[PDB]
Design a protein around this ligand. Structure first.
Ligand SMILES: *[C@@H]1O[C@H](CO[C@@H]2O[C@@H](C)[C@@H](O)[C@@H](O)[C@@H]2O)[C@@H](O[C@@H]2O[C@H](CO)[C@@H](O[C@H]3O[C@H](CO[C@H]4O[C@H](CO)[C@@H](O)[C@H](O)[C@@H]4O)[C@@H](O)[C@H](O[C@H]4O[C@H](CO)[C@@H](O)[C@H](O)[C@@H]4O)[C@@H]3O)[C@H](O)[C@H]2NC(C)=O)[C@H](O)[C@H]1NC(C)=O
Ligand SMILES: *[C@@H]1O[C@H](CO[C@@H]2O[C@@H](C)[C@@H](O)[C@@H](O)[C@@H]2O)[C@@H](O[C@@H]2O[C@H](CO)[C@@H](O[C@H]3O[C@H](CO)[C@@H](O)[C@H](O)[C@@H]3O)[C@H](O)[C@H]2NC(C)=O)[C@H](O)[C@H]1NC(C)=O
Ligand SMILES: NC[C@](O)(CS(=O)(=O)O)c1ccc(Cl)cc1
Ligand SMILES: *[C@@H]1O[C@H](CO)[C@@H](O)[C@H](O)[C@H]1NC(C)=O
Lengths: 406, 403
């Protein structure tokens, strides 16, 4: 007979704070072609896309969410990208019994089943850095940690999660300092209580300000280890900032030896995943559909998560299969898709795809250290299987990592 | 009589606690709608208010709004938005349907951001509107040095944050800034130790009883101290662990409470031809068994703002309305421009907006033996303070000094 059309209502940020839809929409289009051309996944169903440009704006997204829900055809799932767009659609979704699957939202707040009961994300939460941090603290035998953050909900939530994770490992947070824009008084305070192991959470502009202030107070050297986020631009510390007094040399000096954690978004292995593509082939195939270069295209590094989200849905819809009967007033099919989505376990272009109880993606983390003004891969950590890959590439002045104490 | 449809959005259900604001204001709304029709003020048209229940919930509220657009008549504007998170969602999206919104109860300062909420207006002053009033009070009593005590909850930290800008370029020093989450006693100890005399408090009713208990224990009360705290607490709130009731009342004695003025005290005829006193009587008869709400005057004046806006928008069109779909950007812009012209004497005083924000009246109260008593008002339009002679009092021969 005929394959029944089954619809996804997606929102792609083509502009805004995170213009991730630029590469994620083509990656979504490619994944649908790959799933629909597979006779073994949904033989009786054809998965189709209906999308709108959210502009990474919740106000804008409210207009398109209406457009998706109040116009035929009925959609079985909603796929937002930006964290602010997901916070709005994932909360609203229960009124239309809709599963919500995000390909780009990292906000820790989205891992709340009370506010977001049908929510899943192939993009991990910013809290995924915390198990890697506690493991590195354990490896190097540290139990006294200082934390410094910029005043943002994401950074406060990340540190709130780090508090409960260190308590479990018999580790404590000595000092916690915050700053809206100027980090002069928080860094001066770290020096005063003689903090040794510091977890610093801030954006790049604020990192430059933190590390200039770190040079001045000599909060770098053999004594100190800084744990930062690994998503900053290459040579961020060398970038010219007129509001910073420190020189390139001074700040290449201040950042020396610091550790970074970064969520793995593309499998570094040359293995073939469920689609039978390799990471390298996915990248080459994606580069071909793009109008501009990967460097110019927003959401290029997140594009494999968007590709994997379509596969997670396809495989979940495959496990259940009466999809045309879906209506916004019925929980039946939703709860069955929810159960199938919750039981996700497959190999995607981003690596192994699994969700925790909150619907947040579980993934590997890349651990790097800045050695001689350049980041060097010192290993990877898999939080779900407590698997640490050590490179034996890390370097310390003492010939060994220092300690939390005087 | 073609209808001019208005989308009324508010919690109306008994199952929702804020449902009392929505129901409390409906008799005031009915009185304004009645007079406008009875007097045919918008002839040929009649003001058609449709009501949709938000249930003070983000999801139910958004669906109520979506269901109003889908199945309801063509609304020209939005009237309501009570709960802060629901109002923020609706207010942010307004341009998508070219809908101007007028709220009578959402006081969250967040909504003053016209980059995020350009189509949003409110007849009620925001939580931050107490700050230019407090500046006037400090200037009046020559208080040049203050300390702050704030609860670490967004509703209060937003007010404290705004105070910084209000007191900048003025001759007033914030000598000590103290915050607390659950217990204010450590923060009250620091203020005492820094010899603070004038305290600007921003915390809830539950925390207020704790604050004044710590104040008694630290002797941060009497002739040398002045506490300036929220004026919106339930009456007899203090009656509702270590301190005694007599010791709480001793420390509370003379605190200044600050909040918006529910209705004008001026015995002058408003736009409807009634004085605020005559309106208040008409509202109390109309409400019957429904519990009164302090936002009733704001809802009443809110309907008059809509009627006046529509009259002016009708004049603008006549110079060069049924055709309005949520598509007409130009009609929405006309409605927006006409609302910005609002200038009339309402039951809540003069109704004027400064960038969608109400310029209104702030009430000053003083706790005297058993209750809060009115001691003054601040007029935001004129930026003036009027202190009620023979009401405000101090335990010493002079008001306290700031050091
Ligand atoms: C998952 O991935 C790879 C993908 O293959 C390549 O990569 C893509 C990105 C594209 O660039 C593709 O065009 C490209 O193929 C799949 O692996 C290949 O798939 C087939 C599966 O059998 C293989 O094709 C031939 O295999 C044998 C023998 O091939 C010989 O030659 C190569 C060098 O050229 C040697 O290295 C091999 O060891 C071997 O000696 C051949 O007999 C078949 O030919 C035909 O024979 C009949 C004759 O009567 C015909 O009637 C039929 O047409 C029959 O097919 C195949 O042509 C191919 O070599 C491998 N390649 C690799 C790299 O392993 C893999 O199958 C796919 N998995 C899926 C789809 O599930
Ligand atoms: C939105 O309203 C603003 C305020 O309008 C004023 O107050 C209303 C309550 C109502 O009474 C209305 O009629 C008033 O005009 C508008 O800003 C004001 O608009 C004027 C510009 O047209 C400006 O005035 C000038 O008038 C002369 C010009 O030489 C001078 O005497 C005076 O110094 C002013 O420059 C006025 O200053 C300005 N108001 C404020 C407080 O800044 C605003 O344009 C309007 N926008 C619309 C309708 O789209
Ligand atoms: N990786 C994409 C995204 O998670 C998108 S968002 O969650 O911030 O909307 C993101 C995360 C952190 C930063 Cl700095 C920018 C973007
Ligand atoms: C899809 O579901 C069918 C139903 O049993 C199963 O046979 C098939 O292997 C599934 N496909 C994948 C790729 O898991």
């Amino acid at each position: 007979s005929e394959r029944r059309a089954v619809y996804i209502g997606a929102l792609f940020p083509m502009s805004g704070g995170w213009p991730g839809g630029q590469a994620c929409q083509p990656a979504v289009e490619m994944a649908l072609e790959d799933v629909n051309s597979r006779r073994d996944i949904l033989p009786d169903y054809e998965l189709k896309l209906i999308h709108h440009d959210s502009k990474c704006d919740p106000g804008q997204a409210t207009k398109y969410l209406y457009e998706l829900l109040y116009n035929d055809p009925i959609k079985i799932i909603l796929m937002p990208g930006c964290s602010s767009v997901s916070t709005l659609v994932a909360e609203a979704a229960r009124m239309w019994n809709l599963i919500v699957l995000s390909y780009g939202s990292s906000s820790p707040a989205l891992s709340n089943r009370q506010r977001f009961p049908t929510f899943f994300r192939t993009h991990p939460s910013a809290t995924l850095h915390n198990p890697t941090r506690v493991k590195l603290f354990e490896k190097w035998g540290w139990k006294k940690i200082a934390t410094i953050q910029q005043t943002t909900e994401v950074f406060t939530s990340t540190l709130d999660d780090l508090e409960e994770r260190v308590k479990e490992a018999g580790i404590e947070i000595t000092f916690r300092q915050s700053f809206f824009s100027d980090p002069a008084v928080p860094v001066k305070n770290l020096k005063r209580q003689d903090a040794r192991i510091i977890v610093g959470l801030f954006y790049e502009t604020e990192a430059r300000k933190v590390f200039c202030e770190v040079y001045k107070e000599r909060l770098f050297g053999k004594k100190y280890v800084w744990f930062l986020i690994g998503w900053y631009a290459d040579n961020w510390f060398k970038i010219y900032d007129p509001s910073i007094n420190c020189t390139v040399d001074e700040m290449t000096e201040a950042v020396e030896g610091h550790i970074t954690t970064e969520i793995v978004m593309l499998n570094p292995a040359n293995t073939r995943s469920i689609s039978n593509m390799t990471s390298q082939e996915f990248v080459e195939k994606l580069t071909k559909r793009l109008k501009r270069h990967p460097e110019e295209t927003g959401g290029f590094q997140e594009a494999p998560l968007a590709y994997d989200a379509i596969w997670a849905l396809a495989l979940a819809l495959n496990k259940t299969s009466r999809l045309e009967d879906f209506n916004y007033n019925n929980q039946t099919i939703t709860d069955q898709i929810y159960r199938a989505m919750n039981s996700s376990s497959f190999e995607g272009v981003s690596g192994h795809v699994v969700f925790d109880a909150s619907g947040s993606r579980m993934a590997w983390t890349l651990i790097e250290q800045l050695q001689g003004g350049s980041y060097k891969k010192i290993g990877y950590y898999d939080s779900t299987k407590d698997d640490l890959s050590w490179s034996k590439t890390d370097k310390w002045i003492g010939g060994s990592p220092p300690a939390d104490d005087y | 009589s073609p209808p001019l449809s208005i989308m009324g959005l508010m919690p109306l259900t008994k199952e929702v606690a804020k449902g009392s604001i929505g129901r409390g204001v409906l008799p005031a709304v009915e009185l304004a709608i009645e007079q406008i029709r009875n007097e045919s003020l918008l002839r040929p048209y009649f003001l058609d208010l449709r009501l949709y229940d938000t249930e003070c919930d983000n999801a139910k509220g958004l669906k109520a709004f979506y269901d109003a657009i889908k199945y309801g008549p063509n609304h020209l504007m939005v009237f309501g938005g009570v709960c802060p998170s629901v109002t923020s969602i609706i207010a942010e999206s307004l341009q998508g349907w070219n809908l101007v919104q007028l709220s009578f109860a959402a006081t969250t300062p967040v909504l003053a951001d016209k980059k995020k909420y350009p189509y949003f207006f409110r007849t009620v002053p925001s939580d931050n509107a107490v700050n230019p009033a407090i500046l006037k009070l400090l200037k009046h009593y020559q208080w040049k040095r203050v300390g702050t005590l704030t609860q670490d909850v967004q509703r209060f930290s937003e007010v404290r944050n705004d105070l910084t800008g209000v007191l900048y370029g003025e001759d007033i020093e914030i000598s000590d800034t103290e915050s607390f989450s659950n217990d204010p006693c450590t923060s009250v100890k620091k203020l005492k130790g820094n010899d603070v005399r004038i305290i600007l408090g921003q915390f809830d009713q539950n925390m207020a009883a704790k604050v004044f208990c710590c104040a008694y224990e630290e002797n941060m009360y009497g002739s040398k101290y002045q506490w300036i705290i929220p004026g919106w607490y339930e009456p007899s709130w203090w009656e509702q662990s270590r301190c005694l009731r007599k010791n709480l009342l001793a420390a509370m004695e003379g605190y200044i409470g600050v909040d918006f003025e529910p209705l004008s005290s001026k015995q002058i005829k408003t736009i409807s031809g009634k004085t605020p006193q005559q309106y208040e009587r008409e509202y109390n008869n109309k409400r019957s068994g429904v519990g009164p709400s302090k936002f009733h005057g704001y809802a009443y004046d809110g309907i008059w703002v809509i009627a006046k806006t529509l009259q002016r928008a009708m004049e603008t069109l006549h110079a060069s309305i049924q055709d309005f779909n949520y598509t007409d950007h130009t009609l929405g812009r006309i409605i927006l421009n006409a609302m910005n012209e609002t200038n009339f004497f309402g039951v809540t005083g003069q109704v004027v907006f400064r960038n969608g924000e109400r310029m209104g009246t702030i009430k000053f109260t003083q706790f005297q033996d058993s209750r809060e008593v009115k001691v003054g008002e601040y007029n935001a339009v004129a930026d003036t303070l009027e202190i009620i002679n023979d009401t405000i009092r101090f335990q010493g021969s002079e008001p306290p000094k700031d050091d």
